[PDB]
PDB file of N, CA and C in Angstrom:
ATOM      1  N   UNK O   1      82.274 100.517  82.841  1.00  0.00           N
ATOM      2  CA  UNK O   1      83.082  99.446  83.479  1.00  0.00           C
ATOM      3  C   UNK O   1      83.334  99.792  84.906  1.00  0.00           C
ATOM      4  N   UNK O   2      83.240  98.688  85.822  1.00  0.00           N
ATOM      5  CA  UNK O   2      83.573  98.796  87.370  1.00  0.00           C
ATOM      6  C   UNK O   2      85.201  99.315  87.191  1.00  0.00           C
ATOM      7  N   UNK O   3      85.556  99.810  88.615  1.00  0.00           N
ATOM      8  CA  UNK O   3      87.372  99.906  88.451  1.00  0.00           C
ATOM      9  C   UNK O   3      88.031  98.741  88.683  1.00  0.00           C
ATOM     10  N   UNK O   4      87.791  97.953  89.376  1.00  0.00           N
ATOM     11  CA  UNK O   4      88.460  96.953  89.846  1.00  0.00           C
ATOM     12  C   UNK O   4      87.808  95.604  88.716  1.00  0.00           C
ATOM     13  N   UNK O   5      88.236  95.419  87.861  1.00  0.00           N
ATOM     14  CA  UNK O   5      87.359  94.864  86.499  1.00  0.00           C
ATOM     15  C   UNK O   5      88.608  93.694  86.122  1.00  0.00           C
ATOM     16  N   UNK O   6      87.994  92.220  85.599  1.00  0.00           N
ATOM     17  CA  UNK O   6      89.110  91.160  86.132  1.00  0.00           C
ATOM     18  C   UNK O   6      89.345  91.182  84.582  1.00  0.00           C
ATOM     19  N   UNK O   7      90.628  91.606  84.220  1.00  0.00           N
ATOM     20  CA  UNK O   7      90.839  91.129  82.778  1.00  0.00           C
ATOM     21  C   UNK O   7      92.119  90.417  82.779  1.00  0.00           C
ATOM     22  N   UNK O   8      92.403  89.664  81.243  1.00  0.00           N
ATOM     23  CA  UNK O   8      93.013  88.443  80.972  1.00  0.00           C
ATOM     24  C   UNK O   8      94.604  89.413  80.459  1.00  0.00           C
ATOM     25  N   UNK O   9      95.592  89.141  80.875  1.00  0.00           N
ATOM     26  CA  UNK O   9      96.521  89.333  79.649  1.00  0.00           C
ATOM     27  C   UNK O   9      97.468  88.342  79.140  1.00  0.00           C
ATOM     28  N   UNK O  10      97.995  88.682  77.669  1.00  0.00           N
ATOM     29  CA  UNK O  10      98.495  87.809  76.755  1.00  0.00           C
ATOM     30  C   UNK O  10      99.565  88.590  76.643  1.00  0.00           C
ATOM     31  N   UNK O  11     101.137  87.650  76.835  1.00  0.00           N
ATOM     32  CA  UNK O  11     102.184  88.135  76.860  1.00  0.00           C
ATOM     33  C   UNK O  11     103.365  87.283  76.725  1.00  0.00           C
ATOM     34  N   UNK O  12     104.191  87.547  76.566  1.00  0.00           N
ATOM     35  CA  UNK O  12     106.048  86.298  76.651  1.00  0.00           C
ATOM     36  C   UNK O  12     106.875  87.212  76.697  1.00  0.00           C
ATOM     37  N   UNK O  13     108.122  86.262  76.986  1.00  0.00           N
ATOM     38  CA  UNK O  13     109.095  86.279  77.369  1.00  0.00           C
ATOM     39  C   UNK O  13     110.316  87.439  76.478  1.00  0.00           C
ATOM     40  N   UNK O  14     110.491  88.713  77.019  1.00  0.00           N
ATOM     41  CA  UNK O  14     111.001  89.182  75.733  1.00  0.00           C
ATOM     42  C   UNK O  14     112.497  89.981  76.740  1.00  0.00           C
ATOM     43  N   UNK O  15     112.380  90.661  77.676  1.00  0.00           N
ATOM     44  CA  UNK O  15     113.355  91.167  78.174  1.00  0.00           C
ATOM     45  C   UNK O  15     113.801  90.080  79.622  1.00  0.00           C
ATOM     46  N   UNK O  16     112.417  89.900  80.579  1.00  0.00           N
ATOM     47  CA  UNK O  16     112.586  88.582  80.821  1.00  0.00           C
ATOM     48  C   UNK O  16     110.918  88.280  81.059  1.00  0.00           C
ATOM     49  N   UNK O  17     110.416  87.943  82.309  1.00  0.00           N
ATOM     50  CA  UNK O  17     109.539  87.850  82.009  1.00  0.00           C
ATOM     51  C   UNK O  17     108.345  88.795  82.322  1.00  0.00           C
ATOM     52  N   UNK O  18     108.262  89.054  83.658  1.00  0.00           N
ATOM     53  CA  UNK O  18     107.369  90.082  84.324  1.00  0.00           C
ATOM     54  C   UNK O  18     108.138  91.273  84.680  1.00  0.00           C
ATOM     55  N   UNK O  19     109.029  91.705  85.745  1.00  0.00           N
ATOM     56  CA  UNK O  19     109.564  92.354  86.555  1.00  0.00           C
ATOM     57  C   UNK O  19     108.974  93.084  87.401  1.00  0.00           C
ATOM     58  N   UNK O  20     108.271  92.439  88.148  1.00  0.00           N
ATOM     59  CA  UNK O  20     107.096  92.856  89.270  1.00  0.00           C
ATOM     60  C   UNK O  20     107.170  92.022  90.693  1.00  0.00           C
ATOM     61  N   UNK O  21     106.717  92.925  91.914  1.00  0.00           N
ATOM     62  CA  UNK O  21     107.714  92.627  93.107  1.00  0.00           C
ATOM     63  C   UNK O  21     105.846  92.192  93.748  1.00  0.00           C
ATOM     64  N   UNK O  22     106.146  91.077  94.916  1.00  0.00           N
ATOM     65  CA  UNK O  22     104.908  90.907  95.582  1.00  0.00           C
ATOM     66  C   UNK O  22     104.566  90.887  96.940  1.00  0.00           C
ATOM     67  N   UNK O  23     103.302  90.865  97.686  1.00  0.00           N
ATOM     68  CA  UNK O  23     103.266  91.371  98.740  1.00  0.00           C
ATOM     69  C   UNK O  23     101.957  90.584  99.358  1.00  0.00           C
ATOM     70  N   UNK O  24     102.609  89.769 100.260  1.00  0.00           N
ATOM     71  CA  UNK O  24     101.269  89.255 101.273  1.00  0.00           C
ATOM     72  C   UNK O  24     101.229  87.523 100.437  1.00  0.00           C
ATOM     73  N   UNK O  25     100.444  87.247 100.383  1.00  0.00           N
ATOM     74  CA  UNK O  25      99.779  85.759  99.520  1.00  0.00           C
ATOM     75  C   UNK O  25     100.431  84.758 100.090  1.00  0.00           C
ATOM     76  N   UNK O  26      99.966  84.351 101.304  1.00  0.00           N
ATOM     77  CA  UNK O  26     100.224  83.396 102.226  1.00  0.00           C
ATOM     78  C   UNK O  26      99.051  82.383 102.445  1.00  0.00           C
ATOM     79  N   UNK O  27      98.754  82.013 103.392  1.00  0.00           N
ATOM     80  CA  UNK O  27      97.868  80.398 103.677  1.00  0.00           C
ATOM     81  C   UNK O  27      96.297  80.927 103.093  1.00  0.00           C
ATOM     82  N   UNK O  28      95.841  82.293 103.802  1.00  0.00           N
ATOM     83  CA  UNK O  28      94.986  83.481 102.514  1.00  0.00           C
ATOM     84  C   UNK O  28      95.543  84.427 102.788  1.00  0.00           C
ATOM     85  N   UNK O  29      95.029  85.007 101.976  1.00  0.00           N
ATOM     86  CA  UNK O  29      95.511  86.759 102.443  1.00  0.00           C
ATOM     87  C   UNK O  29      94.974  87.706 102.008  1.00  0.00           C
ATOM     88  N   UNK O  30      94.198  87.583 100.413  1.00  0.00           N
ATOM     89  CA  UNK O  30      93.299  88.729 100.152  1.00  0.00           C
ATOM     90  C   UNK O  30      91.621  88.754 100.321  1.00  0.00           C
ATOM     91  N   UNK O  31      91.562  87.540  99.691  1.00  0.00           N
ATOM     92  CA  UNK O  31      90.300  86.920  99.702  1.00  0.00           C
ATOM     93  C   UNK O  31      89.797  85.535  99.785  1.00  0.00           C
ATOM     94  N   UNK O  32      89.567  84.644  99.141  1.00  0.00           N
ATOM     95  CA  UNK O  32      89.676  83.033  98.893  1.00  0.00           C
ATOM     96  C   UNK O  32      91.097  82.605  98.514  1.00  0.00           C
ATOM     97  N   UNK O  33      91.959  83.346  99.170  1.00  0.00           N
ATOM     98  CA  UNK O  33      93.387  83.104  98.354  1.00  0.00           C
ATOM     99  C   UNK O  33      93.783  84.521  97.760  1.00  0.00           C
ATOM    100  N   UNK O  34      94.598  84.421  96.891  1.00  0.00           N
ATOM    101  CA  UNK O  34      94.751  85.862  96.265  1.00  0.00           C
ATOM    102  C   UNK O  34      96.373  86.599  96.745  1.00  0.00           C
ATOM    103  N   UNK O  35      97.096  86.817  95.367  1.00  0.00           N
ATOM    104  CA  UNK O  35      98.239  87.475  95.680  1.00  0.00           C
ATOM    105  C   UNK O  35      98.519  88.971  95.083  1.00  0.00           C
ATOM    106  N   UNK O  36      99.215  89.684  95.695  1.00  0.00           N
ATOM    107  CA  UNK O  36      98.965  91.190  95.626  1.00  0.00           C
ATOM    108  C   UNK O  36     100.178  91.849  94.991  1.00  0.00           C
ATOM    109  N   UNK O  37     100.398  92.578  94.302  1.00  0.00           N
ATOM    110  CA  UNK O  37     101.150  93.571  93.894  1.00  0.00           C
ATOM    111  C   UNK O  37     101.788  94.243  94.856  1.00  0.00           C
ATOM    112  N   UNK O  38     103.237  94.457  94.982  1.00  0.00           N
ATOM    113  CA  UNK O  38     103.973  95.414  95.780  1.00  0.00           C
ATOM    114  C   UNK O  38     104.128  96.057  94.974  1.00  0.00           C
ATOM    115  N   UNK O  39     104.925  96.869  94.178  1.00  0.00           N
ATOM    116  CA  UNK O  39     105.596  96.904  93.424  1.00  0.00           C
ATOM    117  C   UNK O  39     105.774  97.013  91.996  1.00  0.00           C
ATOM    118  N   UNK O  40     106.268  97.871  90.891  1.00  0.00           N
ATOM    119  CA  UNK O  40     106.719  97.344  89.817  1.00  0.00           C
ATOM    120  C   UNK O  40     108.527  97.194  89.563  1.00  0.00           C
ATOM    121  N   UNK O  41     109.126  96.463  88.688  1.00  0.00           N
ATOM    122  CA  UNK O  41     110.284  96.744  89.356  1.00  0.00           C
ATOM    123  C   UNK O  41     111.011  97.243  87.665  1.00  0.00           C
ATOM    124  N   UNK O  42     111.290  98.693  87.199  1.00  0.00           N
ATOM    125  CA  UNK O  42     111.830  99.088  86.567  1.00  0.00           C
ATOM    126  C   UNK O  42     112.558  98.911  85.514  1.00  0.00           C
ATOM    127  N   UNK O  43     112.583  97.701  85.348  1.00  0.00           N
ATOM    128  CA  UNK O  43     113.704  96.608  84.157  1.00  0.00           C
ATOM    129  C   UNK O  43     112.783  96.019  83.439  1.00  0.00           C
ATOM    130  N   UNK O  44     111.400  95.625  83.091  1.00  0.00           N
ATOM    131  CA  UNK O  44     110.417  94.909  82.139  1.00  0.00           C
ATOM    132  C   UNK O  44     110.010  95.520  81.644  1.00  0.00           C
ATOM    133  N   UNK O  45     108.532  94.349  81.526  1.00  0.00           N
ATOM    134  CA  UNK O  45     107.629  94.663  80.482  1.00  0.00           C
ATOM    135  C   UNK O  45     106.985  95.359  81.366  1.00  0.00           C
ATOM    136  N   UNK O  46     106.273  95.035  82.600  1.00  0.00           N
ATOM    137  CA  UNK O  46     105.362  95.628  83.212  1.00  0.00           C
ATOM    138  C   UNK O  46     105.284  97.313  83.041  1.00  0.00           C
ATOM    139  N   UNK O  47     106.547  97.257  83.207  1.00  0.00           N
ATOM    140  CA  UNK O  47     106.570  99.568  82.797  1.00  0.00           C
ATOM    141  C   UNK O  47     106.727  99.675  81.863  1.00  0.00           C
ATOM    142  N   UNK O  48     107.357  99.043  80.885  1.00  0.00           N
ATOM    143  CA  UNK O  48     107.893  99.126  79.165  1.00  0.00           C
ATOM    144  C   UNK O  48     106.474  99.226  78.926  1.00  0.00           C
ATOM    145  N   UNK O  49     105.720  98.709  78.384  1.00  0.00           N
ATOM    146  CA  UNK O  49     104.814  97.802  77.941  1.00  0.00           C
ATOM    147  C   UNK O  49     103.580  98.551  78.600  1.00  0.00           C
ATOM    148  N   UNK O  50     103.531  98.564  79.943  1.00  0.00           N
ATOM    149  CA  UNK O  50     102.641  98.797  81.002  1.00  0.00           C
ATOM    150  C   UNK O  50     100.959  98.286  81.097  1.00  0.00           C
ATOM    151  N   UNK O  51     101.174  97.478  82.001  1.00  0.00           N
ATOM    152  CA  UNK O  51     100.084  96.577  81.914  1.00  0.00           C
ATOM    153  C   UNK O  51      99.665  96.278  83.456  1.00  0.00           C
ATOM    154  N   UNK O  52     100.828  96.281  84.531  1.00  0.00           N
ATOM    155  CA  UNK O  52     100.474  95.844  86.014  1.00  0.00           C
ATOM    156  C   UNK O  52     101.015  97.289  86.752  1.00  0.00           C
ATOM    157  N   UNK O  53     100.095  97.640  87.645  1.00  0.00           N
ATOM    158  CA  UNK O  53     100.618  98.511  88.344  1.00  0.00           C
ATOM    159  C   UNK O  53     100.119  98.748  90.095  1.00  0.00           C
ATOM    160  N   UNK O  54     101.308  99.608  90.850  1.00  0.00           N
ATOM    161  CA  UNK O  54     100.881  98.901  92.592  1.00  0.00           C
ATOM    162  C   UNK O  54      99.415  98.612  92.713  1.00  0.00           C
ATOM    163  N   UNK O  55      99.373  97.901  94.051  1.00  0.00           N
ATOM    164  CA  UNK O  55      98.199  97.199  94.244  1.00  0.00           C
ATOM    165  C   UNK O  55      97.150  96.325  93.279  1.00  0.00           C
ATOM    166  N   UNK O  56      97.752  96.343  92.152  1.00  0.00           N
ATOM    167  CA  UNK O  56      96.788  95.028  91.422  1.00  0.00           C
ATOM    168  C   UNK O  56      96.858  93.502  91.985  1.00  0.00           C
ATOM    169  N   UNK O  57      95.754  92.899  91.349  1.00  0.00           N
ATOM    170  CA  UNK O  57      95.567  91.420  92.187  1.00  0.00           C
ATOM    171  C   UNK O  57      95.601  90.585  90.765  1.00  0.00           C
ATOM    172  N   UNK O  58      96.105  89.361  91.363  1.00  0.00           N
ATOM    173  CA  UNK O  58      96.060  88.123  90.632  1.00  0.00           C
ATOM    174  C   UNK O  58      94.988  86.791  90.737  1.00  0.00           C
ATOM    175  N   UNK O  59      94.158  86.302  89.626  1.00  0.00           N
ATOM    176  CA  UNK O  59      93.382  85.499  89.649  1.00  0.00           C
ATOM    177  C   UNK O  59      94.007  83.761  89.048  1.00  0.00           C
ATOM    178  N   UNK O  60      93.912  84.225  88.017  1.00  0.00           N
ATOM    179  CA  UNK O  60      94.122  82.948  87.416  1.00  0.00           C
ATOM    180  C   UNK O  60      95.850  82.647  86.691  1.00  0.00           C
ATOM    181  N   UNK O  61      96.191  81.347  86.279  1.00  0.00           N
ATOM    182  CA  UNK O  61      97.195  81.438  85.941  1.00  0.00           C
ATOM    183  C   UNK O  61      96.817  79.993  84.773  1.00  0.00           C
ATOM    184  N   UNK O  62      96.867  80.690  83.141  1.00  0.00           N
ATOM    185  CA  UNK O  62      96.770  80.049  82.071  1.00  0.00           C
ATOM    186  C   UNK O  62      95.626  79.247  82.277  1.00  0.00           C
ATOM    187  N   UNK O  63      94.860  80.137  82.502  1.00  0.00           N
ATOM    188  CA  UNK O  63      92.932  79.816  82.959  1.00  0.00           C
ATOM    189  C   UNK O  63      92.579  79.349  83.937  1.00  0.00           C
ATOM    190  N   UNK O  64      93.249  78.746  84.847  1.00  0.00           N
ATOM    191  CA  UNK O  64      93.193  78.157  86.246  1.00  0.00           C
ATOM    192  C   UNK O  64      93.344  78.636  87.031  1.00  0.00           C
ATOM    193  N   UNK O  65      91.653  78.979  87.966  1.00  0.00           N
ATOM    194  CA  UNK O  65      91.548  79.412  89.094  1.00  0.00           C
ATOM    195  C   UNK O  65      92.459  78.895  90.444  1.00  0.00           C
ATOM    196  N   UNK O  66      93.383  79.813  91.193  1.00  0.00           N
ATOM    197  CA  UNK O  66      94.374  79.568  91.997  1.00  0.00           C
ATOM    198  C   UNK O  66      93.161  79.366  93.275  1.00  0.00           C
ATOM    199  N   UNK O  67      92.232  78.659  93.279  1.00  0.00           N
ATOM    200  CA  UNK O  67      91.537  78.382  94.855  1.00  0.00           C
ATOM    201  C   UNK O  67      92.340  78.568  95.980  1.00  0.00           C
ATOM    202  N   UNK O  68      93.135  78.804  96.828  1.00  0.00           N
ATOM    203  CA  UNK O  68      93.660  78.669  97.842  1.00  0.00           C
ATOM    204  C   UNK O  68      95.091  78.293  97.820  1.00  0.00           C
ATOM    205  N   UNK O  69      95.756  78.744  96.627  1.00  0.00           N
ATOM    206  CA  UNK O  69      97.360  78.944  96.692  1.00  0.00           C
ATOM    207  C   UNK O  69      97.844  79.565  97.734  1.00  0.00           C
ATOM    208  N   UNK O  70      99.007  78.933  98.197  1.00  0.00           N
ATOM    209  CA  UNK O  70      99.675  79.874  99.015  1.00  0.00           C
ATOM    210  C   UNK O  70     100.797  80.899  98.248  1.00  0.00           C
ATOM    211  N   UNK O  71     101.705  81.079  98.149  1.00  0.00           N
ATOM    212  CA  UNK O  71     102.891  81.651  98.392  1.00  0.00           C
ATOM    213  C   UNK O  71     104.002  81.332  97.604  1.00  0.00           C
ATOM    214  N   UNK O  72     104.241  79.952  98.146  1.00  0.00           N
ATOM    215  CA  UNK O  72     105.020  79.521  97.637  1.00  0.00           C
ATOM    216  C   UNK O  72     104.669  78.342  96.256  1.00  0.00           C
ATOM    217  N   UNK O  73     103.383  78.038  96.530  1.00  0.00           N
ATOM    218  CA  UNK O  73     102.542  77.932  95.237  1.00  0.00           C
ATOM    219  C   UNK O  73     102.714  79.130  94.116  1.00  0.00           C
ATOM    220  N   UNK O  74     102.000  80.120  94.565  1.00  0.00           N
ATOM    221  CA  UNK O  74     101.985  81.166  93.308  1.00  0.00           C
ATOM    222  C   UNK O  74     103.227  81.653  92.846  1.00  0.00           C
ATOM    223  N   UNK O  75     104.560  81.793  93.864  1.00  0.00           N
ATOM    224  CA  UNK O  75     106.156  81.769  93.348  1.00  0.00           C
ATOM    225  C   UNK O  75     106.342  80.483  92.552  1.00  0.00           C
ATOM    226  N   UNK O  76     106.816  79.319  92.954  1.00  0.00           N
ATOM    227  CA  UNK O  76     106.518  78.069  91.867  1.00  0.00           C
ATOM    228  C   UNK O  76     106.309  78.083  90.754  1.00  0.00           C
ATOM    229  N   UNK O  77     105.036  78.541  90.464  1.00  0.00           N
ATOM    230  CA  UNK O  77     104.022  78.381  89.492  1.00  0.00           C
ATOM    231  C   UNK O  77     104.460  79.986  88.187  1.00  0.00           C
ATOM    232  N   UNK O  78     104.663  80.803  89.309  1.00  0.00           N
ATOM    233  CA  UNK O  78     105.562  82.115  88.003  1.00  0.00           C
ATOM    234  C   UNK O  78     106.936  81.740  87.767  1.00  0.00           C
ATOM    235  N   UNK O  79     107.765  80.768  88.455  1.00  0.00           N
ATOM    236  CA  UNK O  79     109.064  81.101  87.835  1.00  0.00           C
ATOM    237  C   UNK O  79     109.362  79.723  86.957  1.00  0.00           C
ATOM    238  N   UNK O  80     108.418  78.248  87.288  1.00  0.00           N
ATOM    239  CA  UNK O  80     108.211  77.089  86.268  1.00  0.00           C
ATOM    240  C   UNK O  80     107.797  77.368  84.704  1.00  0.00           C
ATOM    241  N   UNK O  81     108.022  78.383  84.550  1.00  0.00           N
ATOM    242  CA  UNK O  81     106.789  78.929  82.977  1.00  0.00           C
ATOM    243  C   UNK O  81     107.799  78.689  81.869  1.00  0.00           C
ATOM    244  N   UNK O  82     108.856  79.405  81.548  1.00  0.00           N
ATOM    245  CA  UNK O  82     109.297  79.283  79.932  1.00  0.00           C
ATOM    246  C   UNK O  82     109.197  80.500  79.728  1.00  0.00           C
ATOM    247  N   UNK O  83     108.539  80.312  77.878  1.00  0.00           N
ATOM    248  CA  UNK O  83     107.909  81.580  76.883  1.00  0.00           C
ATOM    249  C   UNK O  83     106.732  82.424  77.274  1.00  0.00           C
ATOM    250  N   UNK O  84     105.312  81.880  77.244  1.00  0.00           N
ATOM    251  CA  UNK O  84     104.465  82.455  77.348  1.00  0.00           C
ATOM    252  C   UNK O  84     103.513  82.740  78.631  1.00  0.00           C
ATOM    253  N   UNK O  85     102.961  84.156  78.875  1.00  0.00           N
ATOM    254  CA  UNK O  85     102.671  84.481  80.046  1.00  0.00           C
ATOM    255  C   UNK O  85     101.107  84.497  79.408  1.00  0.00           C
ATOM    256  N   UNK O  86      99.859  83.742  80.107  1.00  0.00           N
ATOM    257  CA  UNK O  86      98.614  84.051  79.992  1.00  0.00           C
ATOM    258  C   UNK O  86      98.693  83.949  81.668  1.00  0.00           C
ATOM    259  N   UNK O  87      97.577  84.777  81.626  1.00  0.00           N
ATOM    260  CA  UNK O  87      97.671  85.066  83.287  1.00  0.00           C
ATOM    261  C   UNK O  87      95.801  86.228  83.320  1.00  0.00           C
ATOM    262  N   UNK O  88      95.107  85.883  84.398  1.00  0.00           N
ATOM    263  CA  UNK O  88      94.191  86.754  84.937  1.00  0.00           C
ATOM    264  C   UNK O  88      94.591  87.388  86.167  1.00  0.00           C
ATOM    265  N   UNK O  89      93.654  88.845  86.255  1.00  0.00           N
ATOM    266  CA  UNK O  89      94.036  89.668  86.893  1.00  0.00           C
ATOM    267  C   UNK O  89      93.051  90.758  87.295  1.00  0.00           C
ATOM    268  N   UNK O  90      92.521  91.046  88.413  1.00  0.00           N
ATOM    269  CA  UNK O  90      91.681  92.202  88.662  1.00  0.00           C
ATOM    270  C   UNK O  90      92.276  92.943  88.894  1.00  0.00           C
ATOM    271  N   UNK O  91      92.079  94.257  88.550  1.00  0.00           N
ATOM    272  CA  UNK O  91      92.060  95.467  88.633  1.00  0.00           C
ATOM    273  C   UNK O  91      92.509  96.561  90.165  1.00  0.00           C
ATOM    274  N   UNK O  92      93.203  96.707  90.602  1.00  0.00           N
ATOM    275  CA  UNK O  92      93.534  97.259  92.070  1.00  0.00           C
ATOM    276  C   UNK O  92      92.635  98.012  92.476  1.00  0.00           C
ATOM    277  N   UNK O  93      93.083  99.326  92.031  1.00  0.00           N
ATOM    278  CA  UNK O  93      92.966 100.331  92.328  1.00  0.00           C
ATOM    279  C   UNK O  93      92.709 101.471  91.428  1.00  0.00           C
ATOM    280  N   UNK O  94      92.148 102.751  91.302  1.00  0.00           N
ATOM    281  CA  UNK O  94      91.636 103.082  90.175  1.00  0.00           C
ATOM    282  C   UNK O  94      92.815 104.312  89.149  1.00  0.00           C
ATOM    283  N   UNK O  95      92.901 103.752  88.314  1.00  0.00           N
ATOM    284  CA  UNK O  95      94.028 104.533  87.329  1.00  0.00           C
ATOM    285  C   UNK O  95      93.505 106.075  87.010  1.00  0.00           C
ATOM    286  N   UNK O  96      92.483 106.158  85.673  1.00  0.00           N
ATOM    287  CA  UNK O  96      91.791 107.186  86.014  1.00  0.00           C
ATOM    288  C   UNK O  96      90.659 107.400  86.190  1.00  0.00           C
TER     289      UNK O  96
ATOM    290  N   UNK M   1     114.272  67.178 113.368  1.00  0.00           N
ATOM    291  CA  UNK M   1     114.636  68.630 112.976  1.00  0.00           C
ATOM    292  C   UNK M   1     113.756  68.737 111.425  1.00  0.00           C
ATOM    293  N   UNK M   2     114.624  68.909 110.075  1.00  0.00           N
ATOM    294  CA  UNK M   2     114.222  69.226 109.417  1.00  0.00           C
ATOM    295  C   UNK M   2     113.094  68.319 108.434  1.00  0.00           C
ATOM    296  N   UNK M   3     112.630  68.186 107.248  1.00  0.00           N
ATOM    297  CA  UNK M   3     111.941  67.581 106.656  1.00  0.00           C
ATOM    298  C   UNK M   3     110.781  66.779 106.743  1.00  0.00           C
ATOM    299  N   UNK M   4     109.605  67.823 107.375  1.00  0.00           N
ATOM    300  CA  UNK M   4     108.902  67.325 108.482  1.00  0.00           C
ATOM    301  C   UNK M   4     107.798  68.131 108.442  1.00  0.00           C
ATOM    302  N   UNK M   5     108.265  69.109 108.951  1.00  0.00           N
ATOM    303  CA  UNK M   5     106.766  70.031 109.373  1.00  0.00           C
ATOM    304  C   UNK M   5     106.914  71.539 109.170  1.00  0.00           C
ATOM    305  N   UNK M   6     107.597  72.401 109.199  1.00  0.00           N
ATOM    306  CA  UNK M   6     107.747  73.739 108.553  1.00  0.00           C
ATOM    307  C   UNK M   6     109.051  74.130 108.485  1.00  0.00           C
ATOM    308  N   UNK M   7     109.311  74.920 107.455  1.00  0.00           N
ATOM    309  CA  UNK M   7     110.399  75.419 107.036  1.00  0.00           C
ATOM    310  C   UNK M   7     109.874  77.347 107.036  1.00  0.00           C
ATOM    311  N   UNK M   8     111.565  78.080 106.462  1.00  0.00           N
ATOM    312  CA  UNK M   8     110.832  79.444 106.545  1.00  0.00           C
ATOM    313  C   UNK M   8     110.550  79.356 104.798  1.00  0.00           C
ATOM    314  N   UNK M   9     109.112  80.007 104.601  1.00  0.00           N
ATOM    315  CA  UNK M   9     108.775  80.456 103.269  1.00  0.00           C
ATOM    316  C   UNK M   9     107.395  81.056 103.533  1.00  0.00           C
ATOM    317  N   UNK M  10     107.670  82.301 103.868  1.00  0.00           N
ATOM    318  CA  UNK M  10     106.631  83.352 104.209  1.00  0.00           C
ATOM    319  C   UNK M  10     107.066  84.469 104.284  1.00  0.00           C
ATOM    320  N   UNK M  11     107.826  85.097 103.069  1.00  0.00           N
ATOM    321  CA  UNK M  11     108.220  86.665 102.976  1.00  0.00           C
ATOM    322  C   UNK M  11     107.897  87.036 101.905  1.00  0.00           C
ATOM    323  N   UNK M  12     108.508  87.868 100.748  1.00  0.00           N
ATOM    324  CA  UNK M  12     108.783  88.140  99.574  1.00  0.00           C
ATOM    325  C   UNK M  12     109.091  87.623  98.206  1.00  0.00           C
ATOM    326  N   UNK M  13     108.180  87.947  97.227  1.00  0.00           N
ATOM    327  CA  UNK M  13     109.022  87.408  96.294  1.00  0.00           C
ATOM    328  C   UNK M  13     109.620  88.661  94.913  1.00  0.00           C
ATOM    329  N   UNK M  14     110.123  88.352  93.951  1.00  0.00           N
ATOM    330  CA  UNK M  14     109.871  88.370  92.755  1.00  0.00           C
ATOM    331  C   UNK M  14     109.804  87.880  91.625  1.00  0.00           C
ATOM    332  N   UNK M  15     109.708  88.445  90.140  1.00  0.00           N
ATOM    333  CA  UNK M  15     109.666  87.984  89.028  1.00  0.00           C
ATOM    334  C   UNK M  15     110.007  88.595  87.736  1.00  0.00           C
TER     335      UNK M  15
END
């Protein structure tokens, strides 16, 4: 497997929803669009659980390619949700 | 003035 490898995760709402902090994802910013990981933030799933960690990237949201979201699109769009988190995601940076 | 053409929303977020 490449390191930077785009996988899907399946998840909800249990302590709350993510607890993960972000960085950059404006008019573009990584690539065709694309929002970035600052951060994890100590109270979730993300470290409980552990699944996102600094510098990972975000693709899709409940199979839908984000073409050219901005910002305040991809904020919107994470805090409109509810229960369940399906969400795509490449790979940052290399773990081990 | 407002409701028009830009506002501030270009910093930080979380979740």
């Amino acid at each position: 497997p490449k390191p930077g490898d785009i996988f899907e995760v399946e998840l909800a709402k249990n302590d709350n929803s993510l607890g993960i902090s972000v960085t950059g994802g404006v008019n573009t910013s990584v690539r065709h669009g694309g929002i970035y990981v600052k951060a994890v933030i100590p109270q979730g799933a993300a470290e409980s659980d552990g699944r996102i960690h600094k510098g990972d990237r975000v693709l899709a949201v409940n199979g839908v390619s984000l073409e050219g979201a901005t910002h305040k699109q991809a904020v919107e769009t994470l805090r409109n949700t509810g229960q369940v988190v399906h969400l795509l995601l490449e790979k940052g940076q290399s773990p081990t | 003035f407002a409701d028009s053409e830009a506002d501030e929303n270009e910093q930080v977020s979380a979740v």
